[PDB]
Amino acid sequence: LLKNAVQLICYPDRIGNNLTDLHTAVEKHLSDAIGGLHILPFFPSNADGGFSPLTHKEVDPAFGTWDDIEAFTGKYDLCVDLTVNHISDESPEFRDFIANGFDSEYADLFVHVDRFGDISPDDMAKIHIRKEKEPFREVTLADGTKTRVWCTFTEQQIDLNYDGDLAYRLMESYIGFLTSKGVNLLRLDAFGYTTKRIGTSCFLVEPEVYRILDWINEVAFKHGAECLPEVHDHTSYQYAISRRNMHPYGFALPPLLLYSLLDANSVYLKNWLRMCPRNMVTVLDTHDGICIPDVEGVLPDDKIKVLIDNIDARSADPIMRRSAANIHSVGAIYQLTCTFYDALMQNDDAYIAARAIQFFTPGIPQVYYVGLLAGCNDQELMEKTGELRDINRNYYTLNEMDEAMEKPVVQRLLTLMKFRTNYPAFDGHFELNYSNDSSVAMAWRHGEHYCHLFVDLNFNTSKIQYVDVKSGETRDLEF
Amino acid sequence: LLKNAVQLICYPDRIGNNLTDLHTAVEKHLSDAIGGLHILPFFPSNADGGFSPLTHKEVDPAFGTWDDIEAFTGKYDLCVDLTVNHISDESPEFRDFIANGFDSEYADLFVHVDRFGDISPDDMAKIHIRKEKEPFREVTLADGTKTRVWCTFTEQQIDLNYDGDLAYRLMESYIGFLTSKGVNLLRLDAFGYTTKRIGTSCFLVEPEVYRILDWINEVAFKHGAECLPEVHDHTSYQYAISRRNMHPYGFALPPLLLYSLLDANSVYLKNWLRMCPRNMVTVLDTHDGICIPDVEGVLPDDKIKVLIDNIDARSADPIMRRSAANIHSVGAIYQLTCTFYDALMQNDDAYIAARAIQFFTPGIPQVYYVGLLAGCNDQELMEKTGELRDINRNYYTLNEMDEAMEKPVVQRLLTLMKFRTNYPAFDGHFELNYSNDSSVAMAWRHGEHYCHLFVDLNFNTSKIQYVDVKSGETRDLEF
Amino acid sequence: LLKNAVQLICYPDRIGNNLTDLHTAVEKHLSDAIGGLHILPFFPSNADGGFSPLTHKEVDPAFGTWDDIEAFTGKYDLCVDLTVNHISDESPEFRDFIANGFDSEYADLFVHVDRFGDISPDDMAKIHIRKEKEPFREVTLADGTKTRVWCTFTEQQIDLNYDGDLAYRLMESYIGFLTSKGVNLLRLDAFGYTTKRIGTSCFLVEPEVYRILDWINEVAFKHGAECLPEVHDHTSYQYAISRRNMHPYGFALPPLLLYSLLDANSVYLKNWLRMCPRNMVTVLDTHDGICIPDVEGVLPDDKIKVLIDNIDARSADPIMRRSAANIHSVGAIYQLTCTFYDALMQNDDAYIAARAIQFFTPGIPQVYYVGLLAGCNDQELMEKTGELRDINRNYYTLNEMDEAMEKPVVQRLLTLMKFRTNYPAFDGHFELNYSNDSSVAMAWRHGEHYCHLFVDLNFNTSKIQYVDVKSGETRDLEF
């Protein structure tokens, strides 16, 4: 069972310079404001911000050592990524494939396009694409033979074959190793893409997806760990996860609040809270940017287009999903490239109101480090690295964090985080209150402990009244 | 009684450098083209382009002296702003409140939020304040006490309390002082917010708003002045003003004409002219930019959206009404930030035709100085000060005005202005003529005097025939 | 009688530097891929991209000499513009009008506005003019007298008077001179405006328009030439032209295919092909923007708007029809300012599939040179010179053309052009084939010859099977 406390989402080398500077910053500022951390991929990687690991058993020396991770485990929960979809092309398992060919003992670990034979154009159009290329990479073997393997993301990320056995072996080995280092929560990165079957969407293919998911969850349970599957699609998939003793992502909340605050409208927000999946990990911003499909149904389409158009001026080019038309297919707005604070027009009152509502939403709240520091869009960083999502992946030196931590808005956010991590009422049961169509009233009760949020979306006001048990009186939280 | 002549809207320091340079500019070019001036707030002020005056009894020395004001009153009518809603926090009256507290003899001059007690969320959301702030400012007294006062606009503008008596006294004193300096027409700035009553919108609350207006109008009439209440809302309020012997604003005309010219459609224009309120002060441009709510009803919503979408490319970011996440919807725009000349695609024929139709609309026509000079959007000025409305508040040096007066289009406007200010037919009765759905025919008749406007909205042509009484023949105005 | 072969639409000075470089470029690459040329106006001109000729009897020395023109004849058909509506104000015929006044022998060559007497406002609003000014130019005579002449287009273009006799000779003189130089096909520029009658639209006035149009066609037939009247309005006029032994423009095809490919819909396309007027000259791109009114009816309004919204991002500001304030309404756009290659999102497959459907559409296919070279929108050329249509009027040096000819997509188009020009089946009869509502099946048969196109609009695939007479078997055209 995890600690019902705020978690920090952070890179290893983007607060300070390495894992040691990250820990130093946590104890100075967050020592009684968080109960866990999600440390973004810190393995040896050759692409995509750590998400192309050569192995999950080593720490990139540029970041530190395994001892630097275990320094966190003594006091905090530890959430770490398990890239169940893919491993690096420089990994030992895939390098062995290049040398030996199909005779390699790791051959059945990867998805070979040639198993399927001819793939009709109709079956191609079912599959969505995350780059502007067909999801198939042609590699040259050591002996000169050319073959193609499945490749969803950048070409240095080779997808694993969950129709064979080696992939389950490799993941279970990874899981055993990570939990031995104090890992509580396994974020199953890109879990939706593991299920491939020609004639289907090759994404969240039912019921295979539930078999893969029940398997990892069981494997995680021997090793004393729970799972956090990452899926960006219709919220119904979040309920499927929740209903299998796993933690879903509250991905619907970020775009729902952006709308709710911008238009002073609590109707759709209140409806979602009344029925939101339980045991979920709530977020406002992530390392990826605000994802839209996660709010379909939760928010009517016409309001989604309003939301997208409202962020368009404050946001870079969006990340999009495409099909068998890739090059020049426009596609579907997938993620808005924008910090959550710029998405709220840098409105301190509005931003604190979002976090208050997040923290009272049932589930473990994660705060992304840029959001923690009220960071703005990093134009300069995006233009030098070319990575479109780096606009939300600010680098902070120990200097820059201490100064941003003193911003009035960040002091306010740290008051909530202390309150949400420590006050016992959040360990009880959630009771939504009646309110008009422009405000939200949320409360938690655990015995005599009680706290009550009231947010007026017209004026972006945040009020929390809590019961001080040591005196019995009702005080106002100062934030 | 005012002169039925064209009026000039102008700031003190934006033609030349002060009130003396303004007067120099008027005598050189406009001496027989206008009958009055509306000089925008020229008092000591600390916020919002002059509309936060410390007193109505002083002239900001940066602009000149009261003698510089009276230089106009001998030959021209004088329209001056009376900020009936609010005065500055640096005013003598409010500074006494901070020093002495509620022991101040000026205490009951301001609205104290604690008077109302608890305000329900519904009664807050009803309130018509367009900032994403509660209309409440927390001030610190000299003795350390913190209390809250009503504050509609920027925090340097403290709202006045018309449920007590001190506020009426202060207004009566301001009126006495301003009329003693030769002010004919008191522009009642933002009078709509004078009415505070929890449970209402606190804006144009009926029938209280009309008692405040009947009172000020009587006070003004004693001191030889008429009133021009500023209200930007549904035109029904302009008739209520008209029907209480005060001058309403023709705020419906500017966007009504823009559509009419852009689309070659006179239907909604002729319909409005046939029923437009009496005794109004007609404008095309003001110091604020084209206001949308004022034409709702006057013009169907679908045609307003046509207008809004048509101006979007030629205009800066629009001024928005509260919590409007649908930023391209008639219900979201409050004022379009654009000079009137850029709104007509800098088309001389159309711009003159607009002024002609304005000049034959019943009521006193005001010409804004930028419009007078065929000014274009000042990108540089808006980008230099961050004030979005400064795109319509060009600075002119005396040379730059001498230069603009020689532009062919301004010579044309100057001929129309001479005609509307001097030709006697406008002192008679307005007689709308029949026309097709793409043109307007307007005429004035006063005894033997008669003048007739014809505008073909297809081709932006303006044609005026007048009767020369000293010869009896009908001549064409050359413009 | 013309060659049933692909024609090139090209300027004189925009491939290379003059007509000699054009001849060099044509022979180097197109010598057996086209059977004729449309050389855009190469006369002495002072307005509107060459369409204000002082005479049709001279070649602008900036372009070359008549000998450079005759170098194309004998091997290629020659299509040349005849501006039947208007000639330049610097022309010899009109200057004589300025010098002598109505005493000029060329007086009855032009339309004098005072002839009509008063024109009621309704009779002015009827006039089909796409500018916002009366089509009336006030000229000053040498003797100082002021008179007005009819002027549809720019003021350097004075309209001709087909109520008199002088206009018919001038055309008969022009036609005689042009055909003597080897011109086969006279493009009758803007013929719709030749009919003036107060109380009418002054555009395509029936039955007068056919009285004028049957006349020119015979004068052209007398001199061994056929006619290509250009009119941009409803397609009903295209058949009206077709039924009088003249070549209409397939102006409906370009936006029809754009919709059909973008939305994978062959319904409206097949319907058109089944009934399209023939003996027409088919085009995809022209020297003008993609024209919308020419597809009204052929395509439902809702589907045209689908096209407009899809092109909006890849196109410059569209050319508008008169007083169309609703800038996102089918009835408002006149021409889309866009090269045809950018209109299909630089999709090689989609662009070739469009050209394939064009080449099998009954009628002579013209290929515009920008389309020939798969040119993209020329931002740089448009922002200079201010001409909005220069976004589709790329300049190419001889090197730049040699280079574009090596583009894979241009090699494919160049294969089609050779096939369409040489394979004899196109000289036979057209037979539309059955296909589903998202694909097109077109075939031609002439004796032993047979060729068959199949285009899948879902995937932009192009297949042509033809019967090779040199072997008797059915082969696949490789493109």
Ligand SMILES: O=P(O)(O)O[C@H]1O[C@H](CO)[C@@H](O)[C@H](O)[C@H]1O
């Ligand atoms: O959050 P997303 O967009 O669904 O997918 C995520 O996993 C991918 C796997 O490489 C990476 O691109 C990023 O970690 C992120 O985009």
Ligand SMILES: OC[C@H]1O[C@H](O)[C@H](O)[C@@H](O)[C@@H]1O
């Ligand atoms: O505070 C008074 C209000 O009205 C004034 O006319 C101005 O537009 C501005 O100062 C404000 O919007």
Ligand code: NA
């Ligand atoms: Na809000």
Ligand code: NA
């Ligand atoms: Na017009």
